[PDB]
Amino acid sequence: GSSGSSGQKRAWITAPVALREGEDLSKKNPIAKIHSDLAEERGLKITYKYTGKGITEPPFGIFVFNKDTGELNVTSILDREETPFFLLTGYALDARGNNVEKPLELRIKVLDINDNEPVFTQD
């Protein structure tokens, strides 16, 4: 929908992923993807992991990620009833496996079927 049109700066910045439950979200994907620039700059294979509801905690079989491609795709239909919210964290470990750059607080909210979110601006 909107990555980041207006902000303070373009660096290690993330946006609140907003998806509507119901159908299979097998289109928007990838819906998220984080990585260190030093990777493409230098040419190292950075590792990415995700911890939270859907991966480390049930209901299992919700979110899947791979360090080979470095992407996040949903393999299950979201639901406000079962999971009203989804908390996940992104880690950028180096070839060695150390936390060189603090992780990210990726938050994924679940909008109802009739998502009627209000309209406003951020200054």
Side-chain angles (χ1 to χ4, degrees), residues 16-66:
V17 172
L19 316 161
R20 208 167 82 157
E21 51 154 302
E23 330 205 62
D24 323 278
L25 273 301
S26 57
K27 281 205 166 285
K28 275 58 172 176
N29 308 329
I31 53 160
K33 50 174 82 172
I34 58 90
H35 69 102
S36 83
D37 299 297
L38 272 156
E40 44 157 12
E41 270 315 287
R42 283 275 156 163
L44 305 151
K45 181 159 152 281
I46 308 297
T47 312
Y48 328 121
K49 89 208 208 174
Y50 279 84
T51 57
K53 180 154 78 164
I55 306 160
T56 62
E57 294 171 335
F60 332 112
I62 321 283
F63 291 129
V64 306
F65 87 72
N66 198 333

Short mmCIF file of all heavy atoms in Angstrom, two decimals, residues 16-66:
data_model
loop_
_atom_site.label_atom_id
_atom_site.label_comp_id
_atom_site.label_asym_id
_atom_site.label_seq_id
_atom_site.Cartn_x
_atom_site.Cartn_y
_atom_site.Cartn_z
N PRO A 16 4.46 -0.05 9.17
CA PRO A 16 3.48 -0.97 9.76
C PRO A 16 2.68 -1.72 8.70
O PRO A 16 1.78 -1.16 8.07
CB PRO A 16 2.56 -0.04 10.56
CG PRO A 16 2.69 1.29 9.89
CD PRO A 16 4.10 1.36 9.38
N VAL A 17 3.02 -2.99 8.50
CA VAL A 17 2.33 -3.82 7.51
C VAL A 17 0.86 -4.00 7.87
O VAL A 17 0.54 -4.53 8.93
CB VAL A 17 2.99 -5.20 7.38
CG1 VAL A 17 2.15 -6.12 6.51
CG2 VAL A 17 4.40 -5.07 6.83
N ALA A 18 -0.02 -3.55 6.98
CA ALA A 18 -1.45 -3.67 7.21
C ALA A 18 -2.11 -4.54 6.14
O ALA A 18 -2.18 -4.16 4.97
CB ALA A 18 -2.10 -2.29 7.23
N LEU A 19 -2.58 -5.71 6.56
CA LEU A 19 -3.22 -6.64 5.64
C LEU A 19 -4.64 -6.98 6.11
O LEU A 19 -4.92 -6.97 7.30
CB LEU A 19 -2.40 -7.93 5.52
CG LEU A 19 -0.89 -7.74 5.38
CD1 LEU A 19 -0.16 -9.03 5.74
CD2 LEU A 19 -0.53 -7.31 3.96
N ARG A 20 -5.52 -7.27 5.15
CA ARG A 20 -6.90 -7.61 5.47
C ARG A 20 -7.11 -9.12 5.44
O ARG A 20 -6.71 -9.80 4.49
CB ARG A 20 -7.85 -6.94 4.47
CG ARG A 20 -9.23 -6.65 5.05
CD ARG A 20 -10.02 -5.72 4.15
NE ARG A 20 -10.65 -6.43 3.04
CZ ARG A 20 -11.72 -5.98 2.39
NH1 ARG A 20 -12.26 -4.82 2.73
NH2 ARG A 20 -12.24 -6.68 1.39
N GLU A 21 -7.73 -9.64 6.49
CA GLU A 21 -7.99 -11.08 6.59
C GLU A 21 -9.07 -11.50 5.60
O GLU A 21 -9.80 -10.67 5.07
CB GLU A 21 -8.42 -11.44 8.02
CG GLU A 21 -9.55 -10.58 8.55
CD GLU A 21 -10.37 -11.29 9.61
OE1 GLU A 21 -10.92 -12.37 9.31
OE2 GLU A 21 -10.46 -10.77 10.74
N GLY A 22 -9.16 -12.81 5.36
CA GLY A 22 -10.15 -13.32 4.44
C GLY A 22 -9.55 -14.22 3.38
O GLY A 22 -9.42 -15.43 3.58
N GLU A 23 -9.17 -13.64 2.25
CA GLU A 23 -8.58 -14.40 1.15
C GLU A 23 -7.10 -14.69 1.43
O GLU A 23 -6.54 -14.22 2.42
CB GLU A 23 -8.72 -13.64 -0.16
CG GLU A 23 -9.95 -12.75 -0.23
CD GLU A 23 -10.42 -12.50 -1.65
OE1 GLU A 23 -10.78 -13.48 -2.33
OE2 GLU A 23 -10.43 -11.33 -2.07
N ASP A 24 -6.48 -15.46 0.55
CA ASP A 24 -5.08 -15.82 0.70
C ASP A 24 -4.18 -14.69 0.19
O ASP A 24 -4.25 -14.31 -0.98
CB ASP A 24 -4.77 -17.11 -0.05
CG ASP A 24 -5.91 -18.11 0.02
OD1 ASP A 24 -6.01 -18.83 1.04
OD2 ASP A 24 -6.71 -18.17 -0.93
N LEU A 25 -3.34 -14.17 1.07
CA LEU A 25 -2.43 -13.09 0.71
C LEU A 25 -1.22 -13.63 -0.06
O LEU A 25 -0.08 -13.42 0.34
CB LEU A 25 -1.96 -12.35 1.96
CG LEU A 25 -2.86 -11.21 2.44
CD1 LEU A 25 -3.01 -10.15 1.36
CD2 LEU A 25 -4.22 -11.75 2.86
N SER A 26 -1.49 -14.31 -1.17
CA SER A 26 -0.43 -14.88 -1.99
C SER A 26 -0.16 -14.00 -3.21
O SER A 26 0.22 -14.50 -4.27
CB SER A 26 -0.80 -16.29 -2.43
OG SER A 26 -2.04 -16.30 -3.13
N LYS A 27 -0.35 -12.70 -3.05
CA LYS A 27 -0.13 -11.75 -4.14
C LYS A 27 0.80 -10.62 -3.69
O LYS A 27 1.87 -10.42 -4.27
CB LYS A 27 -1.46 -11.17 -4.62
CG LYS A 27 -2.24 -12.11 -5.53
CD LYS A 27 -3.17 -11.34 -6.45
CE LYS A 27 -3.70 -12.22 -7.57
NZ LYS A 27 -2.66 -12.47 -8.61
N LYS A 28 0.38 -9.89 -2.66
CA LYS A 28 1.18 -8.79 -2.14
C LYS A 28 2.63 -9.21 -1.92
O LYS A 28 3.55 -8.45 -2.19
CB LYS A 28 0.58 -8.28 -0.83
CG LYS A 28 -0.53 -7.27 -1.02
CD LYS A 28 -1.67 -7.83 -1.85
CE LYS A 28 -2.86 -6.90 -1.88
NZ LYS A 28 -3.94 -7.40 -2.77
N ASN A 29 2.81 -10.44 -1.43
CA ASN A 29 4.15 -10.96 -1.18
C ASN A 29 5.09 -10.63 -2.34
O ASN A 29 4.72 -10.69 -3.51
CB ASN A 29 4.09 -12.48 -0.97
CG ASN A 29 3.08 -12.88 0.08
OD1 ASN A 29 2.82 -12.13 1.03
ND2 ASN A 29 2.49 -14.06 -0.08
N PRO A 30 6.34 -10.28 -2.00
CA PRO A 30 6.79 -10.21 -0.60
C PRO A 30 6.15 -9.05 0.15
O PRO A 30 6.01 -7.95 -0.39
CB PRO A 30 8.30 -10.00 -0.73
CG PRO A 30 8.48 -9.36 -2.07
CD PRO A 30 7.41 -9.92 -2.95
N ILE A 31 5.77 -9.30 1.40
CA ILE A 31 5.15 -8.27 2.23
C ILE A 31 6.17 -7.63 3.17
O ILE A 31 5.86 -6.69 3.89
CB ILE A 31 3.99 -8.85 3.06
CG1 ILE A 31 4.46 -10.08 3.85
CG2 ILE A 31 2.82 -9.21 2.17
CD1 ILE A 31 3.58 -10.42 5.02
N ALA A 32 7.39 -8.16 3.15
CA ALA A 32 8.46 -7.63 3.99
C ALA A 32 9.80 -8.24 3.62
O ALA A 32 9.87 -9.36 3.10
CB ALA A 32 8.15 -7.89 5.46
N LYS A 33 10.88 -7.51 3.89
CA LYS A 33 12.22 -7.98 3.58
C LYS A 33 13.27 -7.00 4.09
O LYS A 33 13.33 -5.85 3.66
CB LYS A 33 12.39 -8.17 2.07
CG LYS A 33 11.95 -6.97 1.25
CD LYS A 33 12.26 -7.15 -0.22
CE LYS A 33 11.20 -7.99 -0.92
NZ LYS A 33 11.39 -8.01 -2.40
N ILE A 34 14.10 -7.46 5.02
CA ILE A 34 15.15 -6.62 5.59
C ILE A 34 16.53 -7.23 5.35
O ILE A 34 16.68 -8.45 5.26
CB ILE A 34 14.95 -6.42 7.11
CG1 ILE A 34 14.92 -7.77 7.82
CG2 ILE A 34 13.66 -5.64 7.37
CD1 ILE A 34 16.29 -8.24 8.27
N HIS A 35 17.54 -6.37 5.26
CA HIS A 35 18.91 -6.82 5.03
C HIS A 35 19.89 -5.65 5.13
O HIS A 35 19.50 -4.49 4.99
CB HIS A 35 19.03 -7.49 3.66
CG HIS A 35 18.89 -6.54 2.52
ND1 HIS A 35 19.96 -6.06 1.80
CD2 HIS A 35 17.79 -5.97 1.96
CE1 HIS A 35 19.53 -5.24 0.85
NE2 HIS A 35 18.22 -5.17 0.93
N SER A 36 21.16 -5.97 5.37
CA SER A 36 22.19 -4.95 5.48
C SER A 36 22.79 -4.62 4.12
O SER A 36 23.04 -5.52 3.31
CB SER A 36 23.29 -5.41 6.44
OG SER A 36 24.23 -6.24 5.78
N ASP A 37 23.02 -3.34 3.87
CA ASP A 37 23.60 -2.89 2.61
C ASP A 37 24.99 -3.48 2.41
O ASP A 37 25.35 -3.91 1.31
CB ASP A 37 23.66 -1.37 2.56
CG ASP A 37 22.29 -0.73 2.65
OD1 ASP A 37 21.46 -0.96 1.75
OD2 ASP A 37 22.04 0.01 3.64
N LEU A 38 25.78 -3.49 3.48
CA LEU A 38 27.14 -4.02 3.42
C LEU A 38 27.18 -5.32 2.62
O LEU A 38 28.22 -5.69 2.07
CB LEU A 38 27.68 -4.26 4.83
CG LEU A 38 28.37 -3.07 5.49
CD1 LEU A 38 28.33 -3.19 7.01
CD2 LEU A 38 29.81 -2.95 5.01
N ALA A 39 26.05 -6.01 2.57
CA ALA A 39 25.95 -7.27 1.84
C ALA A 39 26.24 -7.07 0.35
O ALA A 39 27.19 -7.62 -0.19
CB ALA A 39 24.58 -7.89 2.03
N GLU A 40 25.40 -6.27 -0.30
CA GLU A 40 25.56 -5.99 -1.72
C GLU A 40 26.81 -5.16 -1.98
O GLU A 40 27.48 -5.32 -3.00
CB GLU A 40 24.33 -5.26 -2.27
CG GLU A 40 23.83 -4.15 -1.36
CD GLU A 40 23.03 -3.10 -2.10
OE1 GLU A 40 22.67 -3.35 -3.27
OE2 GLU A 40 22.75 -2.04 -1.51
N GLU A 41 27.13 -4.27 -1.04
CA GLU A 41 28.30 -3.42 -1.16
C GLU A 41 29.58 -4.24 -1.16
O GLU A 41 30.39 -4.17 -2.09
CB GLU A 41 28.34 -2.40 -0.02
CG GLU A 41 27.62 -1.10 -0.35
CD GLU A 41 27.96 -0.57 -1.73
OE1 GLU A 41 29.08 -0.06 -1.91
OE2 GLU A 41 27.10 -0.66 -2.63
N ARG A 42 29.76 -5.04 -0.11
CA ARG A 42 30.95 -5.88 0.02
C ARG A 42 30.76 -7.19 -0.74
O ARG A 42 31.62 -7.59 -1.52
CB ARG A 42 31.24 -6.16 1.49
CG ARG A 42 31.89 -5.00 2.22
CD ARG A 42 33.40 -4.99 2.04
NE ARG A 42 33.97 -3.66 2.23
CZ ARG A 42 35.26 -3.44 2.44
NH1 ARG A 42 36.11 -4.45 2.49
NH2 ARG A 42 35.70 -2.20 2.60
N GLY A 43 29.64 -7.86 -0.50
CA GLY A 43 29.36 -9.12 -1.16
C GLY A 43 29.29 -10.28 -0.19
O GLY A 43 29.59 -11.42 -0.55
N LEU A 44 28.89 -9.99 1.04
CA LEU A 44 28.77 -11.03 2.07
C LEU A 44 27.35 -11.56 2.14
O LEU A 44 26.39 -10.88 1.77
CB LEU A 44 29.19 -10.47 3.43
CG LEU A 44 30.59 -9.85 3.49
CD1 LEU A 44 30.64 -8.75 4.55
CD2 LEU A 44 31.64 -10.91 3.78
N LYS A 45 27.21 -12.79 2.64
CA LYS A 45 25.90 -13.42 2.77
C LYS A 45 25.33 -13.21 4.17
O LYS A 45 25.59 -14.01 5.07
CB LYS A 45 25.99 -14.91 2.46
CG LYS A 45 24.66 -15.64 2.55
CD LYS A 45 24.68 -16.94 1.76
CE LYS A 45 23.73 -17.96 2.36
NZ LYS A 45 24.31 -18.64 3.55
N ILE A 46 24.57 -12.14 4.35
CA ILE A 46 23.97 -11.84 5.64
C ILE A 46 22.84 -12.81 5.96
O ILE A 46 22.13 -13.28 5.07
CB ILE A 46 23.43 -10.40 5.68
CG1 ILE A 46 24.51 -9.41 5.25
CG2 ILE A 46 22.92 -10.07 7.08
CD1 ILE A 46 25.71 -9.38 6.18
N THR A 47 22.66 -13.10 7.25
CA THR A 47 21.62 -14.02 7.69
C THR A 47 20.45 -13.25 8.31
O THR A 47 20.65 -12.31 9.07
CB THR A 47 22.16 -15.04 8.71
OG1 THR A 47 23.37 -15.62 8.22
CG2 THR A 47 21.13 -16.13 8.97
N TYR A 48 19.24 -13.68 7.99
CA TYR A 48 18.04 -13.04 8.52
C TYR A 48 17.13 -14.06 9.19
O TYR A 48 16.83 -15.11 8.63
CB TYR A 48 17.28 -12.32 7.40
CG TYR A 48 18.18 -11.78 6.31
CD1 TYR A 48 18.03 -12.18 4.99
CD2 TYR A 48 19.18 -10.86 6.61
CE1 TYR A 48 18.85 -11.69 4.00
CE2 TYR A 48 20.01 -10.36 5.62
CZ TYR A 48 19.84 -10.78 4.31
OH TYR A 48 20.66 -10.29 3.32
N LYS A 49 16.68 -13.73 10.40
CA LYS A 49 15.80 -14.62 11.15
C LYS A 49 14.61 -13.85 11.72
O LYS A 49 14.69 -12.64 11.93
CB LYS A 49 16.57 -15.30 12.29
CG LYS A 49 16.57 -14.50 13.58
CD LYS A 49 17.81 -14.79 14.41
CE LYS A 49 17.55 -14.61 15.90
NZ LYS A 49 18.71 -15.04 16.72
N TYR A 50 13.52 -14.56 11.98
CA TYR A 50 12.31 -13.94 12.52
C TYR A 50 11.79 -14.72 13.72
O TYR A 50 11.67 -15.95 13.67
CB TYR A 50 11.23 -13.85 11.45
CG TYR A 50 11.40 -12.67 10.51
CD1 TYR A 50 12.24 -12.75 9.41
CD2 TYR A 50 10.71 -11.48 10.73
CE1 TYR A 50 12.40 -11.67 8.56
CE2 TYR A 50 10.86 -10.40 9.88
CZ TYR A 50 11.71 -10.50 8.80
OH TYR A 50 11.86 -9.43 7.95
N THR A 51 11.49 -14.01 14.80
CA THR A 51 10.98 -14.64 16.01
C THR A 51 9.70 -13.96 16.49
O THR A 51 9.64 -12.74 16.60
CB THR A 51 12.03 -14.59 17.15
OG1 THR A 51 12.41 -13.24 17.40
CG2 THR A 51 13.25 -15.42 16.79
N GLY A 52 8.68 -14.77 16.77
CA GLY A 52 7.42 -14.23 17.23
C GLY A 52 6.25 -15.15 16.92
O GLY A 52 6.44 -16.31 16.57
N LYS A 53 5.04 -14.62 17.04
CA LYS A 53 3.83 -15.39 16.76
C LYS A 53 3.78 -15.82 15.30
O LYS A 53 3.84 -14.99 14.40
CB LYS A 53 2.58 -14.58 17.11
CG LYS A 53 1.28 -15.31 16.84
CD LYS A 53 0.16 -14.81 17.74
CE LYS A 53 -0.39 -13.48 17.24
NZ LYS A 53 -1.71 -13.17 17.85
N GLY A 54 3.67 -17.13 15.07
CA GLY A 54 3.62 -17.64 13.72
C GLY A 54 4.84 -18.46 13.35
O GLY A 54 4.78 -19.33 12.49
N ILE A 55 5.96 -18.17 14.01
CA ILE A 55 7.20 -18.88 13.75
C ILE A 55 7.66 -19.66 14.98
O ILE A 55 7.82 -20.88 14.93
CB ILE A 55 8.32 -17.91 13.32
CG1 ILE A 55 7.87 -17.07 12.13
CG2 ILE A 55 9.59 -18.69 12.99
CD1 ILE A 55 8.68 -15.80 11.94
N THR A 56 7.86 -18.94 16.08
CA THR A 56 8.30 -19.57 17.33
C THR A 56 7.11 -19.99 18.18
O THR A 56 7.21 -20.90 19.00
CB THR A 56 9.19 -18.61 18.15
OG1 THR A 56 8.44 -17.44 18.51
CG2 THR A 56 10.43 -18.21 17.37
N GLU A 57 5.97 -19.33 17.97
CA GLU A 57 4.76 -19.65 18.71
C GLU A 57 3.59 -19.92 17.77
O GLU A 57 3.52 -19.38 16.66
CB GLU A 57 4.40 -18.50 19.66
CG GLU A 57 5.42 -18.29 20.77
CD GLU A 57 5.17 -17.02 21.56
OE1 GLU A 57 4.56 -16.09 21.00
OE2 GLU A 57 5.59 -16.95 22.73
N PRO A 58 2.66 -20.77 18.21
CA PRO A 58 1.48 -21.14 17.42
C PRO A 58 0.49 -19.98 17.28
O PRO A 58 0.61 -18.96 17.95
CB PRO A 58 0.85 -22.28 18.22
CG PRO A 58 1.31 -22.05 19.62
CD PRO A 58 2.68 -21.45 19.52
N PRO A 59 -0.49 -20.15 16.39
CA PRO A 59 -0.64 -21.37 15.59
C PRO A 59 0.46 -21.50 14.54
O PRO A 59 0.67 -20.60 13.72
CB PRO A 59 -2.00 -21.19 14.91
CG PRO A 59 -2.21 -19.71 14.87
CD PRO A 59 -1.55 -19.16 16.10
N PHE A 60 1.16 -22.63 14.57
CA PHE A 60 2.24 -22.88 13.62
C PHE A 60 1.72 -22.86 12.18
O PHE A 60 0.52 -22.99 11.94
CB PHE A 60 2.90 -24.23 13.91
CG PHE A 60 2.82 -24.64 15.35
CD1 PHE A 60 2.04 -25.71 15.74
CD2 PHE A 60 3.52 -23.94 16.33
CE1 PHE A 60 1.96 -26.09 17.07
CE2 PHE A 60 3.45 -24.32 17.65
CZ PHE A 60 2.66 -25.39 18.02
N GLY A 61 2.64 -22.69 11.23
CA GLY A 61 2.25 -22.65 9.83
C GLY A 61 1.56 -21.35 9.46
O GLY A 61 0.41 -21.36 9.02
N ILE A 62 2.27 -20.24 9.63
CA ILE A 62 1.71 -18.93 9.30
C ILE A 62 2.68 -18.12 8.44
O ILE A 62 2.35 -17.73 7.32
CB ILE A 62 1.39 -18.12 10.58
CG1 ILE A 62 0.80 -19.04 11.65
CG2 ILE A 62 0.43 -16.99 10.26
CD1 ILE A 62 -0.65 -19.39 11.42
N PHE A 63 3.88 -17.89 8.96
CA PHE A 63 4.89 -17.13 8.24
C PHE A 63 6.13 -17.99 7.98
O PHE A 63 6.58 -18.73 8.86
CB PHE A 63 5.28 -15.87 9.02
CG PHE A 63 4.19 -14.84 9.08
CD1 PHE A 63 3.80 -14.30 10.29
CD2 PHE A 63 3.55 -14.42 7.92
CE1 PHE A 63 2.79 -13.35 10.35
CE2 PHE A 63 2.55 -13.47 7.98
CZ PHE A 63 2.17 -12.94 9.19
N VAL A 64 6.68 -17.88 6.77
CA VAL A 64 7.86 -18.64 6.40
C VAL A 64 8.93 -17.74 5.80
O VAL A 64 8.63 -16.87 4.98
CB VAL A 64 7.52 -19.75 5.40
CG1 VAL A 64 6.41 -20.64 5.94
CG2 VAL A 64 7.13 -19.16 4.05
N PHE A 65 10.18 -17.94 6.21
CA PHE A 65 11.29 -17.15 5.71
C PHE A 65 12.50 -18.03 5.42
O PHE A 65 12.66 -19.10 6.01
CB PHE A 65 11.66 -16.06 6.72
CG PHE A 65 12.65 -16.52 7.76
CD1 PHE A 65 13.98 -16.74 7.42
CD2 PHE A 65 12.25 -16.73 9.06
CE1 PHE A 65 14.89 -17.16 8.37
CE2 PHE A 65 13.15 -17.15 10.02
CZ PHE A 65 14.47 -17.37 9.67
N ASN A 66 13.36 -17.57 4.52
CA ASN A 66 14.56 -18.31 4.15
C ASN A 66 15.76 -17.38 4.03
O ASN A 66 15.66 -16.29 3.48
CB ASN A 66 14.34 -19.05 2.83
CG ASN A 66 15.35 -20.17 2.62
OD1 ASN A 66 16.46 -20.12 3.13
ND2 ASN A 66 14.95 -21.19 1.86
#
